[PDB]
Design a protein around this ligand. Structure first.
Ligand SMILES: CCc1cc(Sc2ncc(C(=O)O)[nH]2)nc([C@H]2CCCC[C@@H]2C(=O)NCc2ccc(Cl)c(Cl)c2)n1
Ligand SMILES: CCc1cc(Sc2ncc(C(=O)O)[nH]2)nc([C@H]2CCCC[C@@H]2C(=O)NCc2ccc(Cl)c(Cl)c2)n1
Ligand SMILES: CCc1cc(Sc2ncc(C(=O)O)[nH]2)nc([C@H]2CCCC[C@@H]2C(=O)NCc2ccc(Cl)c(Cl)c2)n1
Ligand SMILES: CCc1cc(Sc2ncc(C(=O)O)[nH]2)nc([C@H]2CCCC[C@@H]2C(=O)NCc2ccc(Cl)c(Cl)c2)n1
Ligand SMILES: CCc1cc(Sc2ncc(C(=O)O)[nH]2)nc([C@H]2CCCC[C@@H]2C(=O)NCc2ccc(Cl)c(Cl)c2)n1
Ligand SMILES: CCc1cc(Sc2ncc(C(=O)O)[nH]2)nc([C@H]2CCCC[C@@H]2C(=O)NCc2ccc(Cl)c(Cl)c2)n1
Ligand SMILES: Nc1ncnc2c1ncn2[C@@H]1O[C@H](COP(=O)(O)OP(=O)(O)OP(O)(O)=S)[C@@H](O)[C@H]1O
Ligand SMILES: Nc1ncnc2c1ncn2[C@@H]1O[C@H](COP(=O)(O)OP(=O)(O)OP(O)(O)=S)[C@@H](O)[C@H]1O
Ligand SMILES: Nc1ncnc2c1ncn2[C@@H]1O[C@H](COP(=O)(O)OP(=O)(O)OP(O)(O)=S)[C@@H](O)[C@H]1O
Ligand SMILES: Nc1ncnc2c1ncn2[C@@H]1O[C@H](COP(=O)(O)OP(=O)(O)OP(O)(O)=S)[C@@H](O)[C@H]1O
Ligand SMILES: Nc1ncnc2c1ncn2[C@@H]1O[C@H](COP(=O)(O)OP(=O)(O)OP(O)(O)=S)[C@@H](O)[C@H]1O
Ligand SMILES: Nc1ncnc2c1ncn2[C@@H]1O[C@H](COP(=O)(O)OP(=O)(O)OP(O)(O)=S)[C@@H](O)[C@H]1O
Lengths: 160, 160, 160, 159, 159, 160
């Protein structure tokens, strides 16, 4: 090849094993995995950018090649700047498919050199979303099956 | 990082620009690309195995890293025999999404070392299929927009 | 307006109240409606081309400006030949939507002066198809709510 | 036997997908009838009698599940037997749209039968008879998808 | 009270679509609990109290239906009261995908609760609370869509 | 035929080439086209009613038969006042289809004299929404391919 980077964009509010299975399935497929998050999203999520970045950073410790960045402008500009010709997105459902088809179509208009590549969520994590883990957290049920140790502790302390 | 082979499977009956677009977009992302055809399916169609393979070769000759192969037996065993750790499939529409989700779930049960990735069809080929191209060729309308020139000449011939 | 014609294609095997609904809602919007069927289908359903046209002919007798025709080749060519600028189709479900999208994108590349307009099935006929009416008829249940009196007689005869 | 549920299907052959639906049903009704259409046509792979034999053995261990065949309309088998309820499984959007059409028709055929749907378990969602059989045709392992006695019938048939 | 079924929702307000699901269940279990969530958020249009009142009146002809509020997990409610079945309606593809995600979670949350679905009847497939309110804000006729008691409550609220 | 009016309702926040293509494909099939906007929609967007109205008027001025209006009240009550028997909408994907099915089922109960007709998005406009054109405009990327020039000017101003 050459030297190979893939970007894995997301909100990760918070990161879950669903998101991790995708990053983990990407690690020995590329040289460098950049987990990437949006700055001044203007939405507002349960957790701040910083906490979100640290929750990722602690969850992805056991994988050397994964970095965690933030940005700024267009994601396709990031891939341009930094040497990645490949974006990785997961699919859980028809819903995801539709939303991603319109984004990829726009991105391919913005930068024809970048490709987006999809992976199907695996079976035991396809119903996982952070929205719904956050909901279960609010009722203080056991989330240990859904998110890693660190973000588990960050949601207990958030919902009490 | 290590050598990468991707397998791009299909019946290619015949190959279309839609198929070509997916092969082209993957060439700079893997070291080797195997285009795989199903040796002796019991599901016979317009062109012979051998006609189909030649049409691929002629349409893929401007791409040095693309080889065209035939196999009977399970697809995940072909990948295993040639060391390919990745299958590549295109997605046109929701119906594709669903059928693909089902096949990838079984292929993963068959051999969990092989990962399937997807690319979305380009907006301009999203409606192309072998099926709809053959129908159009049977009323000998013009198909130069839909298949490469070798395939075009073979369609006018077939439906003369 | 001009002298306007609209073409309403299909298999009609047999025509149902579902089809007739679409036809009736169209008849006051164009000077002339053409119900068109493909000749030499090499698809064979249950009723021959001749039977199918007679059924259509008897079911639309009460609308002066509807005509029944057969063709030959490409739908957009019939439209070109007869001076029609509009194809009309019905939509029952997402399944219909996705299929019809693929077909009109192609018809657009074949002749961009023909437009296709869609109508939603009315609520009471959304679940009707020729296929499921045929199955009901095999068990000789009452289909009078699904097909018009003449198609009904043709169906009772066909299935005993 | 105050309540009865019918679980109709081709079952060509039955799989752990079908069987999970049946298992999740047994404790909610007094009696479960698994029904298969007699004098269908277009079969292949297994005959009616083979298909019935395969099901009755895979459900042996569920004391309230009986296997029957019928050649008329489902909704009539139901009124024949006293069942107020049909049970079907959903794996995907395509099943959902298919079943929406069947049940709208079924409701014009007989307004007192209800059809209740259960989502396929996450582990079995990808399973169909069609694809178990592709896999068996390449002599690959299928114990994770069908019960042992169905597995054996499949090896015999695909050598 | 051998068998209980829980029918959960916002019911903001209840409509004939919801009632048709509720009515289609009553003959199938001994006891139906329409439940609603205490301490919600995003609402509007009617308060918890007004909502439970409208339900109560709308189902008073159904001896075995009770309306309850609850503050925890739907799946907690069920175990506590002995309900092993939850019932939900499907109008459309979008409902199917959303509900797949919920059931998959609830099944992790508790494994002895089934969710069973029923298809909307064809006459009520396009009815939602959302769109009924829309049409009542413009003073159109909603009597085809909601029961007479909820009609009056809509008329008042929107003039 | 008699004199025909079609209404094409929308937020148009802003109008895009996607909307316009629809409008243009309708001009030849009806006598008058009223492009209509809701007057005090209480979920405000990026342009006011006044701006949106100006932006349309400029964009459709070559199409003499197209007129811009605003209404307070039901869409079908507007159609009744002006004598329009037809409403026209465009569909880009599955989610448009389902949403539109439910709206039209209701509109048919409110007034069964009005027909809603549907047209598929042309392929190159399939991924365009106002939404995604604004997000791209906020990051100051070229949007001239997505909207006509008058509209391109205003969001250069709005996101400067
Ligand atoms: C497929 C990856 C992706 C995902 C998304 S996400 C989204 N969809 C809708 C909204 C929106 O309306 O804000 N955002 N957005 C995009 C682009 C879509 C087209 C417009 C520009 C978007 C873009 O590049 N935005 C900045 C960004 C920066 C860093 C990260 Cl990590 C991300 Cl995800 C996005 N491509
Ligand atoms: C995503 C690639 C793919 C595509 C398909 S295609 C298809 N799935 C069902 C039917 C059928 O029933 O006829 N056909 N089939 C498969 C496998 C799916 C799981 C069962 C085994 C399938 C398998 O490996 N089959 C042989 C084969 C060999 C070499 C080639 Cl190149 C191909 Cl494509 C297939 N994976
Ligand atoms: C939406 C109207 C329509 C419906 C269909 S229906 C169908 N038949 C087979 C397929 C297929 O293989 O997709 N689709 N086929 C078509 C065309 C799709 C583009 C390829 C050419 C098709 C075409 O023009 N085919 C001849 C024809 C069909 C119907 C009638 Cl009435 C006539 Cl006169 C001629 N457009
Ligand atoms: C909801 C179960 C069901 C299923 C089906 S058919 C199917 N759906 C998926 C597959 C499949 O995957 O093979 N087949 N067909 C029907 C009816 C549809 C309306 C027309 C009458 C049909 C009717 O009553 N037909 C006789 C029948 C069918 C099945 C059995 Cl068991 C019996 Cl005894 C009688 N309702
Ligand atoms: C299928 C019934 C249902 C419906 C919903 S509804 C909804 N609320 C927010 C969202 C969401 O963020 O998705 N979904 N939420 C749920 C649960 C899904 C699993 C996570 C926990 C949810 C849970 O148990 N919530 C409490 C509740 C209690 C009693 C009533 Cl009556 C209701 Cl409606 C909800 N299951
Ligand atoms: C497809 C045309 C259309 C589009 C929409 S849009 C929408 N549906 C839900 C929401 C909502 O909940 O806010 N909005 N709403 C409608 C009607 C659907 C039935 C209820 C009443 C809606 C109606 O007539 N509304 C006023 C209106 C006036 C003038 C214009 Cl131009 C429009 Cl678009 C709408 N039909
Ligand atoms: N359980 C999962 N399995 C596979 N992919 C996932 C999973 N959850 C999320 N993803 C994908 O990971 C990418 C980034 O996810 P997010 O942006 O964090 O999800 P989101 O839509 O912003 O909020 P959620 O996770 O759906 S509530 C998207 O492509 C998601 O579809
Ligand atoms: N126009 C296209 N754009 C992107 N991918 C495509 C396109 N056409 C086909 N593919 C994908 O290429 C892979 C192999 O396609 P084929 O198997 O050869 O097509 P097929 O499904 O057998 O018959 P058709 O008529 O092409 S759908 C599948 O994942 C297809 O969905
Ligand atoms: N019940 C219905 N309501 C509205 N449109 C319909 C209905 N049935 C069929 N149509 C449409 O009429 C056109 C002709 O369909 P056909 O070709 O006759 O039937 P078909 O779809 O090939 O076979 P079936 O059994 O009707 S699915 C297509 O747009 C159909 O989707
Ligand atoms: N894996 C599964 N999980 C849950 N339900 C299922 C599963 N497989 C089948 N079903 C349901 O079982 C009922 C009857 O199944 P079948 O009629 O035998 O469907 P099918 O024809 O076996 O699928 P094939 O491979 O096309 S034959 C239908 O409502 C199915 O959707
Ligand atoms: N017309 C209908 N027919 C059958 N079921 C319905 C109908 N309308 C709503 N439902 C079901 O009612 C259940 C709970 O009621 P709701 O939670 O209020 O639905 P909702 O989507 O949350 O609110 P809506 O969309 O404005 S009705 C949902 O899961 C729906 O599937
Ligand atoms: N690109 C397009 N091509 C064809 N029709 C479209 C397109 N975009 C929107 N429409 C349709 O025209 C009407 C939409 O007007 P609007 O929805 O109010 O604006 P918009 O482009 O959908 O961006 P949104 O509404 O924020 S998603 C609906 O019928 C849309 O489906």
């Amino acid at each position: 090849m050459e030297h190979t980077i893939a970007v894995i964009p997301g909100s990760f509010d918070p990161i879950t094993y669903g998101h991790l299975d995708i990053i983990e399935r990407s690690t020995d497929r590329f040289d460098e995995i950049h987990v990437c998050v949006l700055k001044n999203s203007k939405k507002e999520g349960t957790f701040s950018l910083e906490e979100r970045m640290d929750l990722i950073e602690q969850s992805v410790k056991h994988l050397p090649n994964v970095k965690v960045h933030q940005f700024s402008g267009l994601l396709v500009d990031y891939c341009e700047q930094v040497g990645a010709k490949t974006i990785i997105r997961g699919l859980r459902a028809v819903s995801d498919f539709e939303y991603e088809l319109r984004l990829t179509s726009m991105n391919k208009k913005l930068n024809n050199e970048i490709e987006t590549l999809y992976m199907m969520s695996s079976t035991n994590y396809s119903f996982i979303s952070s929205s719904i883990v956050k909901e279960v957290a609010a009722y203080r049920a056991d989330i240990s099956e859904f998110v890693p140790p660190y973000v588990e502790k960050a949601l207990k302390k958030k919902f009490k």
